[PDB]
Write a protein that binds this ligand. Structure first.
Ligand SMILES: OC[C@H]1O[C@H](O[C@H]2[C@H](O)[C@@H](O)[C@@H](O[C@H]3[C@H](O)[C@@H](O)[C@@H](O[C@H]4[C@H](O)[C@@H](O)[C@@H](O)O[C@@H]4CO)O[C@@H]3CO)O[C@@H]2CO)[C@H](O)[C@@H](O)[C@@H]1O
Lengths: 97, 365
RNA sequence: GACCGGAGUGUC
RNA sequence: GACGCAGAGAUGGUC
């Protein structure tokens, strides 16, 4: 169901995709919620969880590899992490997180 | 491409590992068996972060709570497999009509006693106070068992009518809780009575109670099949019989069903099925686990037929039948933690029986 | 090599 | 249009 919630945030509000881009968003505290794919390597989900921890940002764990994330965010390529900035008509930061 | 299994510390975890070796020698898949403390408490917290295991083992009760949180994989065994295991054992592992784990065994507490200190075991709880004074002359206790987990004192509190949740037309009424009823009080009182009348210390736990029976220091204990192997090795002449009746009624142990659910988030769910279905749930697997620590009444018909003659399993089957099957709903957790504190506080002194149970009556919902 | 940069882009 | 790289940062830039 959340796959629709993600898509929604993408038409009205801003988001960002990829590792590099989200860590930056965590440093800036501009992202509210982050989303990391299931079978993401360890160093990396540790390093994300770590900035999310320092940034005091929430984390949602997607029940499906980056492959389905890209599909869920309107892309063709794989995306192991999604930084949600502001959500328009969507409620993922106020319902599930 | 591996399978990480979490099984409880008082089970055949070395023997489950032994089943993992065959799985390695026949595909090269790493079967890692661990037995972490408070695993049933950990699995929900660690699967919400995606760091949990692939296969988790526990009695059917903690599985409904997981299923309601989507932490368990919808298991998909074929029609032929389902008819290999008892139709009742699958019911224990069913949440919202969907099968969430594989049944492995039916567990039930029984009266374990020392034939050398007691040829004819008590038929009722009401005679234990006397039998204790009699053994205090020979410098030995009569009954020693773990009073820290409510599961062991429940056969007594349930005996005279105590219950968890009222069962009605299939659904469990989460608002009707039988921990405060007149019957429940009586049984919990009786426990607190032997405690107050110096027949059973209120600080005794699993480690203590097991130690006393196994070192010949007490006539009887209340335990499950798992504790047999360690008793067998103490070289104590022992038997496994029906639980004593309290108030002319049978004790109603909460029957568990050692299930093995799959982590919904696990990447190796496909490998879990091959392992659990064609390497564990077979006369070969259960045997290797049962040789480490007995399962007793087994979910798999094949191996069960073999073990049936054992008079120890006869008792288990007896008690399992005389008692009630544990509900699998998510609210079980609350009722347990709630009754946990009642039996302790009641026996310690903090709260009186009526007070302890009156509080569990509320904390349970 | 380090940094910048954020969706494409190299081949036949 | 298939392959190859490419948000787990591609090609591309600048020192
Ligand atoms: O309060 C702190 C304590 O918390 C923990 O104890 C809890 C369990 O986590 C709950 O799950 C529950 O316990 C039930 C258990 O769920 C149920 O399956 C049954 O378990 C038996 C089971 O038949 C069998 O597999 C065998 O291994 O033993 C189990 C009993 O030990 O009954 C349990 C009730 O005791 O509630 C308890 C607390 O009441 C934690 O594990 C404790 O260490 C901690 O102190």
């Amino acid at each position: 169901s959340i796959n629709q919630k993600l898509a929604l945030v993408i038409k009205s509000g801003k988001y960002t995709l990829g590792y590099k881009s989200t860590v930056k968003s965590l440093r800036q505290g501009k992202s509210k919620l982050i989303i990391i794919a299931a079978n993401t390597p360890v160093l990396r989900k540790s390093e994300l969880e770590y900035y999310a921890m320092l940034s005091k940002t929430k984390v949602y764990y997607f029940q499906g590899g980056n492959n389905e994330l890209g599909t869920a965010v309107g892309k063709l390529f794989r995306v192991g992490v999604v930084s949600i900035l502001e959500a328009g008509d969507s409620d993922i930061l106020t319902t599930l997180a | 491409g591996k399978l990480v299994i979490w099984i409880n510390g008082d089970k055949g975890y070395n023997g489950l590992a032994e089943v993992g070796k065959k799985f390695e020698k026949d595909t090269g898949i790493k079967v890692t068996v661990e037995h972490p403390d408070k695993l049933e408490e950990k699995f929900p917290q660690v699967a919400a972060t995606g760091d949990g295991p692939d296969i988790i083992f526990w009695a059917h009760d903690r599985f409904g709570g997981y299923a309601q949180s989507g932490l368990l994989a919808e298991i998909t065994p074929d029609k032929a497999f389902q008819d290999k295991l008892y139709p009742f054992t699958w019911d224990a592992v069913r949440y919202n009509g969907k099968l969430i784990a594989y049944p492995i065994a039916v567990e039930a507490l029984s009266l374990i006693y020392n034939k050398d200190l007691l040829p004819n075991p008590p038929k009722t709880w009401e005679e234990i106070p006397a039998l204790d004074k009699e053994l205090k002359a020979k410098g030995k206790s009569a009954l020693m068992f773990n009073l820290q987990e409510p599961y062991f004192t429940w056969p007594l509190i349930a005996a005279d009518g105590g219950y968890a949740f009222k069962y009605e037309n299939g659904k469990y009424d989460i608002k009707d809780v039988g921990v405060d009823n007149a019957g429940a009080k009586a049984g919990l009182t009786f426990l607190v009575d032997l405690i107050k009348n110096k027949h059973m210390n209120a600080d005794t736990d699993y480690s203590i109670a097991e130690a006393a029976f196994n070192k010949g220091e007490t006539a009887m204990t209340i335990n499950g099949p798992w504790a047999w192997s360690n008793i067998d090795t103490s070289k104590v002449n022992y038997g496994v019989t029906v639980l004593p009746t309290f108030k002319g009624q049978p004790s109603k142990p909460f029957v568990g069903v050692l299930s093995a659910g799959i982590n919904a988030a696990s990447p190796n769910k496909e490998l879990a099925k091959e392992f659990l279905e064609n390497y564990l749930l077979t006369d070969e697997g259960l045997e290797a686990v049962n040789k480490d620590k007995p399962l007793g009444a087994v979910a798999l018909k094949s191996y069960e037929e073999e073990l049936a003659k054992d008079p120890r399993i006869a008792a288990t089957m007896e008690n399992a039948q005389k008692g009630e099957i544990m509900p699998n709903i998510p609210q079980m957790s609350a009722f347990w933690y709630a009754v946990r504190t009642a039996v302790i506080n009641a026996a310690s002194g903090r709260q009186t029986v009526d007070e302890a149970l009156k509080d569990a009556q509320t904390n349970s919902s």
